[PDB]
Amino acid sequence: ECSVDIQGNDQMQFNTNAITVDKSCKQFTVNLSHPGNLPKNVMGHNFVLSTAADMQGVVTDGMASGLDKDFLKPDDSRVIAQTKLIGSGEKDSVTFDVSKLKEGEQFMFFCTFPGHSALMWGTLHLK
Ligand SMILES: [Cu+2]
């Protein structure tokens, strides 16, 4: 209820490709964890939400803002929600206002650690 728990693992994958957010949620929370034993600088993960059309841009630029910036460009107005980059045995969360989701989609989530978005992406939808 108003939350989803997402794992990114040592196999460069998330546990789901699809998130639903109920419309009667004021806020929605994403809880990210990283089971496994690989460290952040070789298999780090984060959770980033944008519109599908902004995805490409957000990724290309995170790639370059580097590891210290969570592979995210700071002040990226295109990012609706984001976590920090985490490694094995770490966690992170992000809570955001569901009004930020223009009742019209289309939204995708993904990891911006370099190369990962090939495997680590999914959809988020209202309802
Ligand atoms: Cu990743």
PDB file of C-alpha atoms and ligand atoms in Angstrom:
ATOM      1  CA  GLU A   1       0.000   0.000   0.000  1.00  0.00           C
ATOM      2  CA  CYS A   2       1.648   3.141  -1.428  1.00  0.00           C
ATOM      3  CA  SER A   3       5.030   1.451  -1.667  1.00  0.00           C
ATOM      4  CA  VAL A   4       7.064  -1.050  -3.522  1.00  0.00           C
ATOM      5  CA  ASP A   5      10.173  -2.923  -2.491  1.00  0.00           C
ATOM      6  CA  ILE A   6      12.744  -3.286  -5.333  1.00  0.00           C
ATOM      7  CA  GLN A   7      15.998  -5.253  -5.230  1.00  0.00           C
ATOM      8  CA  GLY A   8      18.920  -4.895  -7.567  1.00  0.00           C
ATOM      9  CA  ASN A   9      21.197  -7.928  -7.380  1.00  0.00           C
ATOM     10  CA  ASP A  10      24.628  -9.260  -8.310  1.00  0.00           C
ATOM     11  CA  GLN A  11      23.190 -10.413 -11.700  1.00  0.00           C
ATOM     12  CA  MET A  12      22.629  -6.905 -12.969  1.00  0.00           C
ATOM     13  CA  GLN A  13      18.827  -7.156 -12.629  1.00  0.00           C
ATOM     14  CA  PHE A  14      15.962  -5.765 -10.603  1.00  0.00           C
ATOM     15  CA  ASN A  15      13.309  -8.020  -9.056  1.00  0.00           C
ATOM     16  CA  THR A  16      10.500  -6.482 -11.143  1.00  0.00           C
ATOM     17  CA  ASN A  17       9.953  -4.826 -14.523  1.00  0.00           C
ATOM     18  CA  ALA A  18       6.696  -3.139 -13.506  1.00  0.00           C
ATOM     19  CA  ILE A  19       5.501  -0.905 -10.675  1.00  0.00           C
ATOM     20  CA  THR A  20       1.949   0.191 -10.058  1.00  0.00           C
ATOM     21  CA  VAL A  21       1.060   3.232  -8.020  1.00  0.00           C
ATOM     22  CA  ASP A  22      -2.484   3.644  -6.773  1.00  0.00           C
ATOM     23  CA  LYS A  23      -4.134   6.992  -7.586  1.00  0.00           C
ATOM     24  CA  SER A  24      -5.440   7.463  -4.042  1.00  0.00           C
ATOM     25  CA  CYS A  25      -1.847   7.482  -2.773  1.00  0.00           C
ATOM     26  CA  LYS A  26      -0.677  10.932  -1.655  1.00  0.00           C
ATOM     27  CA  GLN A  27       2.877   9.743  -1.615  1.00  0.00           C
ATOM     28  CA  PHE A  28       4.567   6.696  -2.960  1.00  0.00           C
ATOM     29  CA  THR A  29       7.699   5.078  -1.530  1.00  0.00           C
ATOM     30  CA  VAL A  30      10.276   2.991  -3.284  1.00  0.00           C
ATOM     31  CA  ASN A  31      12.539   0.858  -1.128  1.00  0.00           C
ATOM     32  CA  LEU A  32      15.706  -0.292  -2.822  1.00  0.00           C
ATOM     33  CA  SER A  33      17.993  -2.952  -1.504  1.00  0.00           C
ATOM     34  CA  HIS A  34      20.977  -4.805  -2.897  1.00  0.00           C
ATOM     35  CA  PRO A  35      21.336  -8.394  -1.776  1.00  0.00           C
ATOM     36  CA  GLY A  36      24.494 -10.212  -2.777  1.00  0.00           C
ATOM     37  CA  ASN A  37      28.128  -9.493  -2.218  1.00  0.00           C
ATOM     38  CA  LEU A  38      29.275  -7.174  -4.974  1.00  0.00           C
ATOM     39  CA  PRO A  39      30.421  -3.623  -4.117  1.00  0.00           C
ATOM     40  CA  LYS A  40      29.084  -0.358  -5.414  1.00  0.00           C
ATOM     41  CA  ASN A  41      31.971   0.419  -7.764  1.00  0.00           C
ATOM     42  CA  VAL A  42      31.524  -2.781  -9.805  1.00  0.00           C
ATOM     43  CA  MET A  43      27.860  -3.657  -9.418  1.00  0.00           C
ATOM     44  CA  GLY A  44      26.269  -0.623  -7.809  1.00  0.00           C
ATOM     45  CA  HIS A  45      22.619   0.137  -8.295  1.00  0.00           C
ATOM     46  CA  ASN A  46      20.233   2.995  -8.032  1.00  0.00           C
ATOM     47  CA  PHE A  47      16.623   3.633  -8.799  1.00  0.00           C
ATOM     48  CA  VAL A  48      15.721   6.555 -11.050  1.00  0.00           C
ATOM     49  CA  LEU A  49      12.310   7.520 -12.296  1.00  0.00           C
ATOM     50  CA  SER A  50      11.529   9.672 -15.293  1.00  0.00           C
ATOM     51  CA  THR A  51       9.280   9.915 -18.274  1.00  0.00           C
ATOM     52  CA  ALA A  52      10.151   7.490 -20.957  1.00  0.00           C
ATOM     53  CA  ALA A  53      11.158  10.330 -23.270  1.00  0.00           C
ATOM     54  CA  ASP A  54      13.637  11.775 -20.740  1.00  0.00           C
ATOM     55  CA  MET A  55      15.187   8.365 -19.910  1.00  0.00           C
ATOM     56  CA  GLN A  56      17.924   8.397 -22.523  1.00  0.00           C
ATOM     57  CA  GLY A  57      19.095  11.843 -21.499  1.00  0.00           C
ATOM     58  CA  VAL A  58      19.104  11.166 -17.779  1.00  0.00           C
ATOM     59  CA  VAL A  59      21.228   8.062 -18.343  1.00  0.00           C
ATOM     60  CA  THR A  60      23.804   9.508 -20.749  1.00  0.00           C
ATOM     61  CA  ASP A  61      24.482  12.357 -18.326  1.00  0.00           C
ATOM     62  CA  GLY A  62      24.517  10.353 -15.108  1.00  0.00           C
ATOM     63  CA  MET A  63      27.200   8.234 -16.785  1.00  0.00           C
ATOM     64  CA  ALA A  64      29.433  11.277 -16.623  1.00  0.00           C
ATOM     65  CA  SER A  65      28.495  13.000 -13.390  1.00  0.00           C
ATOM     66  CA  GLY A  66      30.267   9.921 -12.081  1.00  0.00           C
ATOM     67  CA  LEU A  67      30.218   7.497  -9.190  1.00  0.00           C
ATOM     68  CA  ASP A  68      30.431  10.270  -6.603  1.00  0.00           C
ATOM     69  CA  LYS A  69      27.291  11.819  -7.979  1.00  0.00           C
ATOM     70  CA  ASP A  70      25.404   8.493  -7.918  1.00  0.00           C
ATOM     71  CA  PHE A  71      25.815   8.519 -11.698  1.00  0.00           C
ATOM     72  CA  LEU A  72      23.190  11.239 -11.788  1.00  0.00           C
ATOM     73  CA  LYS A  73      23.575  14.795 -13.030  1.00  0.00           C
ATOM     74  CA  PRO A  74      22.709  17.052 -10.114  1.00  0.00           C
ATOM     75  CA  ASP A  75      19.643  19.281 -10.461  1.00  0.00           C
ATOM     76  CA  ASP A  76      18.150  17.063 -13.167  1.00  0.00           C
ATOM     77  CA  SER A  77      14.634  18.440 -13.495  1.00  0.00           C
ATOM     78  CA  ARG A  78      13.821  15.361 -15.574  1.00  0.00           C
ATOM     79  CA  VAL A  79      14.193  13.050 -12.585  1.00  0.00           C
ATOM     80  CA  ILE A  80      10.958  12.625 -10.709  1.00  0.00           C
ATOM     81  CA  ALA A  81      12.587  10.462  -8.097  1.00  0.00           C
ATOM     82  CA  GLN A  82      15.982   9.018  -7.343  1.00  0.00           C
ATOM     83  CA  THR A  83      17.970   6.999  -4.839  1.00  0.00           C
ATOM     84  CA  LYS A  84      21.627   7.062  -4.103  1.00  0.00           C
ATOM     85  CA  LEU A  85      23.762   4.350  -5.653  1.00  0.00           C
ATOM     86  CA  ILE A  86      24.114   1.349  -3.366  1.00  0.00           C
ATOM     87  CA  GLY A  87      26.203  -1.790  -3.128  1.00  0.00           C
ATOM     88  CA  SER A  88      25.802  -5.187  -1.505  1.00  0.00           C
ATOM     89  CA  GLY A  89      24.253  -5.019   1.968  1.00  0.00           C
ATOM     90  CA  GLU A  90      23.056  -1.440   1.579  1.00  0.00           C
ATOM     91  CA  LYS A  91      19.654   0.136   1.083  1.00  0.00           C
ATOM     92  CA  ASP A  92      18.073   3.411   0.104  1.00  0.00           C
ATOM     93  CA  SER A  93      14.573   4.798  -0.240  1.00  0.00           C
ATOM     94  CA  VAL A  94      12.776   7.546  -1.955  1.00  0.00           C
ATOM     95  CA  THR A  95       9.325   8.947  -1.186  1.00  0.00           C
ATOM     96  CA  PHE A  96       7.646  11.340  -3.586  1.00  0.00           C
ATOM     97  CA  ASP A  97       4.372  13.069  -4.217  1.00  0.00           C
ATOM     98  CA  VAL A  98       2.090  11.167  -6.529  1.00  0.00           C
ATOM     99  CA  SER A  99       0.913  14.535  -7.980  1.00  0.00           C
ATOM    100  CA  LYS A 100       4.317  14.613  -9.683  1.00  0.00           C
ATOM    101  CA  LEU A 101       3.096  11.887 -12.008  1.00  0.00           C
ATOM    102  CA  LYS A 102       1.128  13.666 -14.720  1.00  0.00           C
ATOM    103  CA  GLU A 103      -1.989  11.448 -14.720  1.00  0.00           C
ATOM    104  CA  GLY A 104      -0.933  10.634 -18.291  1.00  0.00           C
ATOM    105  CA  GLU A 105       2.419   8.769 -18.021  1.00  0.00           C
ATOM    106  CA  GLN A 106       4.542   7.386 -19.629  1.00  0.00           C
ATOM    107  CA  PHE A 107       7.054   6.592 -16.885  1.00  0.00           C
ATOM    108  CA  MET A 108      10.063   4.288 -16.667  1.00  0.00           C
ATOM    109  CA  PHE A 109      12.483   3.421 -13.877  1.00  0.00           C
ATOM    110  CA  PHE A 110      16.036   2.352 -14.340  1.00  0.00           C
ATOM    111  CA  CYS A 111      19.536   2.159 -12.960  1.00  0.00           C
ATOM    112  CA  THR A 112      22.175   4.611 -14.282  1.00  0.00           C
ATOM    113  CA  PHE A 113      25.266   2.667 -13.263  1.00  0.00           C
ATOM    114  CA  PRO A 114      27.059   2.423 -16.654  1.00  0.00           C
ATOM    115  CA  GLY A 115      25.792  -0.354 -18.906  1.00  0.00           C
ATOM    116  CA  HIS A 116      23.130  -1.471 -16.478  1.00  0.00           C
ATOM    117  CA  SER A 117      20.110   0.199 -18.048  1.00  0.00           C
ATOM    118  CA  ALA A 118      20.181  -2.492 -20.741  1.00  0.00           C
ATOM    119  CA  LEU A 119      18.808  -4.983 -18.184  1.00  0.00           C
ATOM    120  CA  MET A 120      17.727  -2.724 -15.398  1.00  0.00           C
ATOM    121  CA  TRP A 121      14.647  -0.886 -16.530  1.00  0.00           C
ATOM    122  CA  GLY A 122      10.901  -1.146 -16.097  1.00  0.00           C
ATOM    123  CA  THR A 123       7.589   0.662 -16.287  1.00  0.00           C
ATOM    124  CA  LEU A 124       5.702   2.565 -13.665  1.00  0.00           C
ATOM    125  CA  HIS A 125       2.055   3.225 -14.130  1.00  0.00           C
ATOM    126  CA  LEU A 126      -0.860   4.695 -12.195  1.00  0.00           C
ATOM    127  CA  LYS A 127      -3.887   2.563 -11.315  1.00  0.00           C
TER     128      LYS A 127
HETATM  129 CU    CU B   1      22.631  -1.083 -11.582  1.00  0.00          CU
END
